[PDB]
Ligand binder design. Structure first.
Ligand SMILES: [Zn+2]
Ligand SMILES: [Zn+2]
Ligand SMILES: [Zn+2]
Ligand SMILES: [Zn+2]
Lengths: 15, 377, 374
């Protein structure tokens, strides 16, 4: 799933 | 370590809501003993917490009231708590109570002077924690008690943003009523309108528009309309296209991206809508026969069947009945509109490859997957 | 909404108990009954004032609705958590799921059904065990909550408690004589879930309670599930069982060593050869009846290499990872069976690694074999 600290789907955060 | 066992028993009584047992354990103990028992950070189930923190996270209002009124517990002691799967570091009792939705505990802590704008390690506030859940009552209570609505987190995400992404229309409208900046930008440049467009929250989009939220291009080169088109949010695209302050090429790009995305989305596949939006965009390119808006089609690539994107309405009509051609056209258009930016454009490619594999077209599946892995650098 | 029922529901949801009581003053009994029985749909949830108060944890509103107005407890609705959407949930189920102990006490003490079933056939006890709230679990069990009522997949409270990793609730359920040998729809037991997730102490507690070893629907045992998931601690701890024969022990060791080779977030190249060589030396201990491995024919996607049959071959490939990767893949394909779901993804991962390194034909043959396996 995506990281809850940033809701941008186009970012690349380490979950 | 004999007092350590009593500290563990105190933590257990606090965590399970045995306020009488906790009162019996703490009664007439020395001040140093009280401080040691109530400040002992117990580790359990992946959480690190003091009796107050675990009582607030579990919602034991009687235990919280006892600890606050009769034992002078530090209202700002932090710990580590686990909510479902995720973990939060540097969380106070108030933050835990706000995230879990314990209104009585939130009141008890705020009334005893708990720092309402405390920030965790990711710079999350109790207001943000309550906005995630969508608890409008807790959001109101915090905002009224001087909770700063403008404090962002690690990635400059706002309470308005998180509420808009999760679909909490009432919370979004309340925050906008409390003078929250609707044009705040995340670390990447995305806005609450960007977040609401991807999630298809049509009412939140309408509300943000009513409060005059600006359309902005984030660091990924995308408008809220462009984000809605990529995510197959047909209703959001229809709504944003009714906003007059969008140019003709933007409208055509949105229509083309929406139609192309409808063809390779795992959960939103619709070939009819694919052709519908693609043909609408093509028709709108060919209005004034003098001034046709010609499209600069990319050179062909082998993974997409060496096909070239349709340049004219007749070429688009030729492939109306060719389902594979429409799938490939969707992939081509998505690469043309999105490939110039830093966007992981590979999920629909992987889906098309897997669909080909389930129909025994392993060669085309491998071509698609190879091109997808190639696009990631 | 803007009706009287709208304001009633709003006050009940926002915890404003005085406002609710004032809105219900000097009204008839049937009017109050109708107003408090209305199901309101907002925020993605359709619920009654009692249900929304229980979900939000407003204990004062719940006590008012129970003691004074005598609201029915059997009313069900649809509640929405951040992850899922649940139909046919009573106020007690919502309170158990959201972790509101006082509301649970209030509803149970007022005669709410402690064993009410969701459309998923989930009791509130299962919700409390999913959450990991030992207090609510103990309270419900001590008030005649049926420990043996599973969901629509025959997933008991012990299974979800062991999968989620809450050791204390597992200990409590086991001490409450919960059947450890329950099998889900897919034939899996609680020990399978405990091994898959890698919870060491839960596996210890299950072994302490004489958890019967058994195969699942895919044919896997807890040893095999642990070895496939690279949970080496679970394998080493579980191998100390009495019914563990030598054949299955060597099988689990080799499967663990092989799975260590092409798992993305478990890629421990050293442990691959460690466990492979350990299992080989265990095969070659007694030289009178060496339990020799019935190897499989070579495959072109693996470079035509055959699995190592004696220690010399293993120590020959020791310093060749490419070969060790292929060895792990072939050992997995031999042990798990040709037709198993969790066989293709390490092949595809190794192919993707080769594609990134520009070894295109190697990637292509690996992916062809993987797609044929799919
Ligand atoms: Zn971004
Ligand atoms: Zn971001
Ligand atoms: Zn299964
Ligand atoms: Zn199943």
């Amino acid at each position: 799933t995506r990281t809850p600290n940033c809701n941008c789907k186009y970012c690349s955060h380490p979950v | 370590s004999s007092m350590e066992g009593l500290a563990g028993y105190v933590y257990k009584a606090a965590s399970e809501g045995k306020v009488l047992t906790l009162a019996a354990l703490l009664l007439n103990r020395s001040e140093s003993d009280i401080r040691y028992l109530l400040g002992y950070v117990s580790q359990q189930g992946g959480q690190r917490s003091t009796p107050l923190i675990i009582a607030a996270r579990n919602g034991h209002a009687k235990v919280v009231r006892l600890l606050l009124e009769h034992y002078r517990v530090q209202t700002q002691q932090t710990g580590t708590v686990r909510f479902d799967g995720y973990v939060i570091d540097g969380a106070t009792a108030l933050w835990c109570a706000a995230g879990a939705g314990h209104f009585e505990v939130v009141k008890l802590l705020v009334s005893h002077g708990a720092n309402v704008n405390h920030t965790t390690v990711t710079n999350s506030t109790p207001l943000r924690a309550a906005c995630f859940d969508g608890r409008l009552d807790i959001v109101k209570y915090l905002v009224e008690n001087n909770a700063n609505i403008s404090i962002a987190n690690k990635y400059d995400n706002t309470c308005l943003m998180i509420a808009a992404y999760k679909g909490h229309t009432d919370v979004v409208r309340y925050l906008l009523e409390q003078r929250a900046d609707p044009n705040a930008k995340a670390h990447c440049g995305a806005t609450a309108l960007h977040f609401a467009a991807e999630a298809g929250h049509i009412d939140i989009v309408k509300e943000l528009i009513k409060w005059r939220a600006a359309i902005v291009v984030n660091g990924h080169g995308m408008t809220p309309l462009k984000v809605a088109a990529e995510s197959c949010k047909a209703d959001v695209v229809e709504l944003l296209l009714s906003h007059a302050d969008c140019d003709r090429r933007s409208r055509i790009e949105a229509l083309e991206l929406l139609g192309a995305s409808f063809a390779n989305d795992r959960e939103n596949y619709d070939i009819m809508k694919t052709y519908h939006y693609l043909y609408l965009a093509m028709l709108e390119r060919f209005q004034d026969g003098d001034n046709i808006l010609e499209k600069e089609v990319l050179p062909p690539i082998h993974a997409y069947g060496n096909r070239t994107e349709c340049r004219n309405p007749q070429e688009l009509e030729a492939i109306r009945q060719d389902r594979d051609a429409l799938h490939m056209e969707g992939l081509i258009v998505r690469e043309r509109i999105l490939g110039a930016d830093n966007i992981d454009v590979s999920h629909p490619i992987i889906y098309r490859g897997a669909v080909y594999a389930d129909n025994m077209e392993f060669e085309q599946c491998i071509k698609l997957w190879l091109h997808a892995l190639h696009l990631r650098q």
